[PDB]
């Protein structure tokens, strides 16, 4: 099986690069810390305990409030009167690093003025191994360079709004089913424990974690660790994948917090580079923790370091620092777990005072409008048999599909999302907010053929095919809409285990679309997914005229159509992900069946670097739809390609300090005047008997066998090679050639273009080509502009797992400049660079 | 069993009144036409063989087009881009004799536009005997006075915009169960002829009949005799009704076509009064008439005399130069029967020339408007604690129901409306016409609470009980929607065979509301439906703050109500009916199970004139909310009443236009292509009996004709006819009366005084709407409503002397706010 080989120490902050004045902050508060109330800022206080989805009972001698985690990372989950913004994967949509960066500052803001510390997203993991993959569309896309800068841009917004980011789910969380051993048994199936990635190490430093390395040198304050086995190592104590990677070699400085249940051992999780155990107890009110109690226990007896548990509450301390969380701090002044106003402080148990626990803030300010304009500009033209723009002199407008109509049940009318009723504009599960309302195509269509005294008409029951045929056939032009859902694993629509079944679109999709494009010669889809779907028995109908996918459009989603279909905004969407003619042609399947007995499912990676259309190319396959494809209600030419090459670090560490005192086991026995709430998690002991106030059956058990080599070792340690800075050693960004292209817009309408920049990096095994470099240009008609980017050495380099570094291989590189993955008209062989 | 007398002849028109001109030109015209052409105008061309959903084949010889009739009294039937204005019932609740006239007139342009000659509407039978029966919602109010004078002015506004209008049904149709023996059967009863409505003489003229007198004298073109039978004889061969009441009596001057199917013998119906069979055939596309060829054969064989069918062809003609068809006329530029560019010209047996069947014209103009506004102006505030109007400031909405939202069929999903999906804006049955589109309150209402930046959200599923409390527990205000459908008899919906089964509201209603109110201090209810339901579960519970009834409001129906939910229109509507504590304090039920064998169910009005109000005040009930009743933004005061007093025996004898020639004259031209199922006026030869192919042609002839039913001599003027609508003395003004109106409140808006006279006697009831109007006021204005006393509306009908008397019992006024809110009140003075 699989194996995960060790990494210790689990290094310790240093104040690298922007982060040299937060640390310095976090040390000097730290250092005033005894040792409970180090605990405290590392473990959450129990499922249901307080007010947020996570939260830690904070340090109040020090006027330091508990720390208050909440979803999503598309708005504020399990709350009110706050925006529910467009997906991630809109946002890759829109190629757009402005609106990556627009969407993170708003939903910053709204966090913020719900006093939440720290916003649960955004997503690059998983990355999107599977077209079927369950959670995709809350990351960006398949590609790394296209995720990694628009999480990168998405932290921006959200941190420089004043709230620590969450990048997550570090690593290799690429599939929903046998995610969690309780969820799995809940739907029959008996593992003992959760699916294991098993990924070789050039595509874990090519793919995988790429974006993460963008996430930390953009200076993300957290990262949370995933529910899977890496090689047979759990997501929230793999050493190699957080002390060697994310730790010592991207050089994180910031603070990991486990997924919720992804904690799954003490020492092991503390000594492998945890810092933050969420919601902190084992299972959701069991009143037990891994941490808690017994990680003051751990230290007390001298199992785990007093400097790794300092190290934890500096890197906490200091990512809340360095967004400045300190100058907005307020207590949450909503509740996750009800919308009465007044309620028990304690939640779950429904102890505490009993007041105050809703303030109905109402947080959205005019987020409506980056939200309407996000959604026009990720809605992707696929097709256009010159039948788009609409005029808005149409006779008689066919709406059909019931994802253009209201959930009968109200926007929010589903838990968490969980069903797939009237239209798609949010997937279901934890990554989820309430709209404040939902505005339906259905609603903004009608309205606009109102405008224009047209006549129109909605049919939204898709087995209703009769009345479908009928008004097609009296139509001048029948928008259909169609939709495929997913969400996260604990939750199964029509038996898709948060996970797809299949890539067919949902409710009868593709016979609604043939019954009225067999009736109306001027029949335009409109598809709303998580992810691409099968549009091969239609896409080419001869009535087919126009087919758009405008993914999960959130709160304003039929205004953002609107303005799409009647012109007000040209199209600059391109598609972040290969639509193929089958399943097949993707590859990558789900691990759908135990394959290794009773025990962890196996997965495999096999496929190497080659997920998406970096797979599509290898096997010669023909997209549909290819990445980095969409049309405009305008054209643009490439011209002009240029090439110029340009002109373009500690060998150790010091050794882990340690910060404040720790005193005997009765400094921390539960304090006399204290009231212990019922599943509330505290981090003192029952008394100064450190076995009987563990509880723990293996407490003082072969303790030295199971503390790793290498794992206490607080002296200097060696960088390496690629690391030393922020996302990598500093010498990975240096600047090797200068590219550039002139675009015009050669039609008669201002658009946007999305420019692509992709190389061939060379050899036998690597792609044919990968994208590297983009941005949205605005050109108003016959309008030019020289498009000027740059290639560092990462972006030339591939990993070389013998030197341990990136490496830029002796084989000829190409740079290709286009409008697709496919429509690449300009080719520059590069010079050789190191 | 009760009989239905005899009365012959039918009465020939004369020019009576504002007909003068359009009978000139009637009998010069027809003084040209030959036996077959004068054929062609009184008979239809069989069912769905052209274009309208009734069509005859016109006079080609003399330019006259086939008159194109075509449903609904709400608009065009079976078209396109066309509009869907609010039901009759809306109407009644504006009591507004301007909005009702300019209905019609924006249903007249449309009509007209489409090439429609003749408009099937509008409605005032069934009147409303039963609040449960099926049709009651396409015509006004049980209450005559008020039903009267809307009918009349939406009859106005359609002739004034060169349509001819038809008053139907006449009469007595007052339910849909057993209304055709083919339904029944359907419907599994075994019937051997359709339901008799058993009615006395008094409560016919008081009550059924008083609107078409107001019909007949504001110059109404046509009435449709209906499918009942009427002590049994069949409304559309009912000498008495026909003849007597509506010919002799109120002195109608156009013509009576059938209902469709409702044609049940051709000498029968001819001599009894008819004018027009439609569709024309005798079962659908039978290619049988009772009249086409039967018709000319009846002529030329003597037994229906030439007079009869002259005087026929004279009443379609001069209804059709009355209103000005001639100068406005051209084919009709649409298909009923399918929506393709191209098809054979004619439809059910698909033969003809292939060529263009719809021209797809728009003739919408900006009638959305008067849809709109009258939406408005219908939508009656029942209660209001002080929650309406809305400002667009409250924080979180809740709309809730399946009344509220979209027919997931489409607007026009269910055929003739015949479901109850998505918001209710129009009933069902043939008095129906395709929406160009449908807003609903949830459309509205989301729109108008994002103008404001508020939350909202709307609930759909009735059974989502879950999602109802837990969003109503949330929500500032929770908007409830709620309804209950019915319609014409061949479509039933949840075994609703037309007739509704009950007074409760549809689709978990009552649940829903009690869910929401349980839950939300600020819980607003609007009821669509087709007229009165039971509300006693809830309409008192203390978090019900307000309640509404928008009546059928057709196309703009969110608009509508958002316009009066958010104080763009002060509500000035009035209930036109009664809303009881239980289906049991209307009484008058329905006639639901045979109770005459296997011949026609007997339906006996026993309750005499006691129908809605009437009914509830003679057995001392108290409604829920009275007829008369409904709130406003602003308050009205009511004083200053002020009563001052006020200061031909023989017809012609019976004319014949023109010349009937010999049966040859009248065999198919020999070069004309008959089209499979289409009815024409010829014979196959000159043999009369072949050619009429009726098993009883020549059988008993005389024993089978009426007494005087071939009598052409002068005829005595009945004493209370001799005018339009009735001998013109009933229309002399007795007593004026006049009382201060004054808008004491702070909003401008309509007060709707209503005027109540007691007739006084032992049989009478204890109040009767006379006079109304709707006065528009600001806040502080005052105006003096001043209005008269007919010698009619001090009358009541009398047997013996076969006539209006004013009874010698001591009779009141009462002038106030409804029927039951009438704080001024006097003795009237005695006047003859
Ligand atoms: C001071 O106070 C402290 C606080 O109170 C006290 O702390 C207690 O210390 C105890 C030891 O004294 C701890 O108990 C032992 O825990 C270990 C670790 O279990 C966790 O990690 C497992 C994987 O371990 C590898 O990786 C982690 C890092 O991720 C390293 O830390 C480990 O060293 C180890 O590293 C190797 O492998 C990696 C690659 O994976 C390499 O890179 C390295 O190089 C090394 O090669 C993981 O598998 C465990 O998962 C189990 O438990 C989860 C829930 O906790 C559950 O969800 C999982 O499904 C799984 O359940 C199965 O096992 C558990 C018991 O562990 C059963 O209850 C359960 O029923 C299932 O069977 C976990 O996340 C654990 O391995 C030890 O148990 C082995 O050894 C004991 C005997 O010593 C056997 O009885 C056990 O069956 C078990 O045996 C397996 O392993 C043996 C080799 O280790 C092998 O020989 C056997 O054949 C067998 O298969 C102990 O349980 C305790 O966790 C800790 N408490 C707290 C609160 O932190 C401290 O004691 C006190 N100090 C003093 C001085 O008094
Ligand atoms: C009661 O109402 C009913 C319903 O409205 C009336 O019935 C309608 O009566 C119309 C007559 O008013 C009759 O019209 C015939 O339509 C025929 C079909 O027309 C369509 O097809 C043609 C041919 O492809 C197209 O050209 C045309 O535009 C239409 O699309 C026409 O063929 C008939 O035309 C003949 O008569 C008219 C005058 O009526 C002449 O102007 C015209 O030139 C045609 O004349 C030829 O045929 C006639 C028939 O006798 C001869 O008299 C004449 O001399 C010509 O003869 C030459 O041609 C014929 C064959 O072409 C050939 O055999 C011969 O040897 C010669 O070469 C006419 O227009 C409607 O069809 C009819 N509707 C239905 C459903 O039946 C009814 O009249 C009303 N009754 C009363 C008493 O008012
Ligand atoms: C007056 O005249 C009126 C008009 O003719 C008469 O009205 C009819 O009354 C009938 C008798 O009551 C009605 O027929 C009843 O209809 C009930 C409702 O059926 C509809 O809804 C259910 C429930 O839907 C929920 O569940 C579905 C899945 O279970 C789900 O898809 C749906 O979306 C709803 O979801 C919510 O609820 C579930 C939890 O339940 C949640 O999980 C979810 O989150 C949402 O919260 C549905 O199953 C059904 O198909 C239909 O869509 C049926 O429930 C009744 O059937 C029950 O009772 C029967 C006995 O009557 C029995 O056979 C059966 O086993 C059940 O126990 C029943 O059919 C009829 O609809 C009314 N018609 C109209 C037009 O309103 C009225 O009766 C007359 N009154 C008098 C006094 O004469
Ligand atoms: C790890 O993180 C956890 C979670 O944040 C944190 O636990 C919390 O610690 C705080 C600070 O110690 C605890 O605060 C206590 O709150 C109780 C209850 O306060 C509410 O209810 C009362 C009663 O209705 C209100 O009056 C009050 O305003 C609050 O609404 C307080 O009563 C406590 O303060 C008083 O009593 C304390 C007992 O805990 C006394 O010890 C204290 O000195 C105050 O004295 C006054 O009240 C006394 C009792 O009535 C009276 O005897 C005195 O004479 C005097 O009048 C205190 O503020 C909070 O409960 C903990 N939360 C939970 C869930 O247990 C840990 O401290 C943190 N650990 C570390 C090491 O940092
Ligand atoms: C600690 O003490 C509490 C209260 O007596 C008890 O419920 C709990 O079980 C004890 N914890 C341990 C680990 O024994
Ligand atoms: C008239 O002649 C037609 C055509 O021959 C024939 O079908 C029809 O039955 C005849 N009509 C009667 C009443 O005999």
New interface residues.
């Given amino acids: 099986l699989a194996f995960s080989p060790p990494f210790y120490p689990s290094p310790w902050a240093n104040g690298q690069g922007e982060w040299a004045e937060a640390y310095q902050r976090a040390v000097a508060i730290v250092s005033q810390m005894t040792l409970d109330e180090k605990v405290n800022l590392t473990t959450g206080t129990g499922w249901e305990l307080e007010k947020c989805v996570g939260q830690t009972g904070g340090v109040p001698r020090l006027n330091i409030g508990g720390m208050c985690l909440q979803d999503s990372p598309l708005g504020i989950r399990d709350s009110?009167?706050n925006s529910a913004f467009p997906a991630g994967v809109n946002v890759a949509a829109t190629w757009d690093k402005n609106l990556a960066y627009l969407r993170g500052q708003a939903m910053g803001q709204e966090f913020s003025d719900k006093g939440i510390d720290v916003q649960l997203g955004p997503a690059a993991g998983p990355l999107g191994r599977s077209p079927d993959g369950g959670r995709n569309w809350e990351g960006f896309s398949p590609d790394p360079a296209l995720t990694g800068v628009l999480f990168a841009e998405t932290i921006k917004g959200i941190q420089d709004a004043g709230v620590v980011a969450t990048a997550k789910h570090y690593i290799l969380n690429e599939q929903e089913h046998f995610r969690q051993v309780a969820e799995a048994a809940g739907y029959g199936f008996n593992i003992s424990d959760t699916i294991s990635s098993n990924v070789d190490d050039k595509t874990i430093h090519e793919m995988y974690l790429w974006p993460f390395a963008d996430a930390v040198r953009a200076g993300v304050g957290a990262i949370m660790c995933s529910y899977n086995q890496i090689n047979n190592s759990y997501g929230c104590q793999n050493s190699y994948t957080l002390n060697k990677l994310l730790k010592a070699e991207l050089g994180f400085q910031g603070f990991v917090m486990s997924d919720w249940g992804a904690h799954h051992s003490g020492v092991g999780s503390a000594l492998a580079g945890l810092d933050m155990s969420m919601p902190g107890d084992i299972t959701f009110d069991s009143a037990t923790s891994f941490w808690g109690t017994n990680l003051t226990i751990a230290v007390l007896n001298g199992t785990v370091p007093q400097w790794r548990v300092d190290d934890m509450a500096v890197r906490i301390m200091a990512a809340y620092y360095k967004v400045g969380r300190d100058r907005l701090y307020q207590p949450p002044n909503f509740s996750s777990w009800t919308?009465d106003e007044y309620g028990f402080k304690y939640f779950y148990p429904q102890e505490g005072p009993y007041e105050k626990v809703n303030h109905?803030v109402?947080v959205?300010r005019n987020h409506?409008e980056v939200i309407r304009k996000l959604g026009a500009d990720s809605t992707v033209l696929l097709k256009n048999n010159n039948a788009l723009p609409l005029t808005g002199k149409e006779?008689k407008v066919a709406i059909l599909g019931?994802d253009a109509?209201?959930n009968?049940?109200?926007?929010?009318?589903c838990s968490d999302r969980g069903c797939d009723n009237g239209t798609l504009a949010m997937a279901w599960g934890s990554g989820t907010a309430e709209?404040?309302?939902?505005?339906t195509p259905?609603?903004a269509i009608?309205?606009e053929?109102?405008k224009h005294?047209?006549?129109?008409?909605?049919?939204?029951?898709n087995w209703?095919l009769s009345?479908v045929e009928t008004?097609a056939?009296?139509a001048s032009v029948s928008l259909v809409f169609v939709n495929s859902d997913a969400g996260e694993g604990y939750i199964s629509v029509d038996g898709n285990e948060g996970d797809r079944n299949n890539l067919t679109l949902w409710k009868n999709g593709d016979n609604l679309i043939k019954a009225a494009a067999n009736n109306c010669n001027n029949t335009i889809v409109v598809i709303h997914s998580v992810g691409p779907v099968l549009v091969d028995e239609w896409y080419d109908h001869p009535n087919v005229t126009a087919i758009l996918w405008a993914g999960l459009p959130g709160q304003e989603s039929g205004n953002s159509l609107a303005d799409v279909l009647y012109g007000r905004v040209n199209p600059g969407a391109k598609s972040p992900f290969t639509w193929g003619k089958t399943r097949e042609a993707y590859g990558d399947y789900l691990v759908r069946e135990l394959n290794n007995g009773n025990g962890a499912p196996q997965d495999d990676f096999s496929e190497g670097v080659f997920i998406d259309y970096r797979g599509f190319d290898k096997r010669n396959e023909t997209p549909i739809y290819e990445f980095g494809h969409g049309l405009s209600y305008t054209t643009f030419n490439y011209s002009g390609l240029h090439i110029q090459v340009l002109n373009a670090v500690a060998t150790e560490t010091g050794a882990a300090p340690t910060f404040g005192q720790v005193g005997n086991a009765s400094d921390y026995v539960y304090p006399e005047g204290l009231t212990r709430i019922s599943k509330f998690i505290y981090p003192w002991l029952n008394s100064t008997d450190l076995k009987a106030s563990s509880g723990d059956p293996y407490y003082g058990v072969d303790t030295a066998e199971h503390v790793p080599e290498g794992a206490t070792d607080g002296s200097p340690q060696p960088v390496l090679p690629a690391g030393g800075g922020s996302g990598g050693n500093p010498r990975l960004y240096d600047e090797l050639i200068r590219v550039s292209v002139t675009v015009k817009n050669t039609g008669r309408v201002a658009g946007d273009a999305v420019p692509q920049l992709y190389v061939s990096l060379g050899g036998p095994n690597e792609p044919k080509v990968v994208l590297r470099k983009f941005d949205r240009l605005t050109l108003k008609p016959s309008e030019e502009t020289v498009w000027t980017t740059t290639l560092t050495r990462r972006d030339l380099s591939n990993w070389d797992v013998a030197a341990q570094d990136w490496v830029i291989t002796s084989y000829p590189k190409k740079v290709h400049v286009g409008s697709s993955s496919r429509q690449l008209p300009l080719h520059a062989a590069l010079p050789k660079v190191q």
């Fill in positions: 009110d009167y919308r109905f109402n959205q409506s006779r019931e109509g209201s009968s049940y109200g926007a929010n009318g709209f404040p309302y939902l505005v259905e609603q009608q309205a053929v109102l005294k047209g006549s129109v008409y909605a049919i939204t029951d209703a009345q008004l056939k009296q």
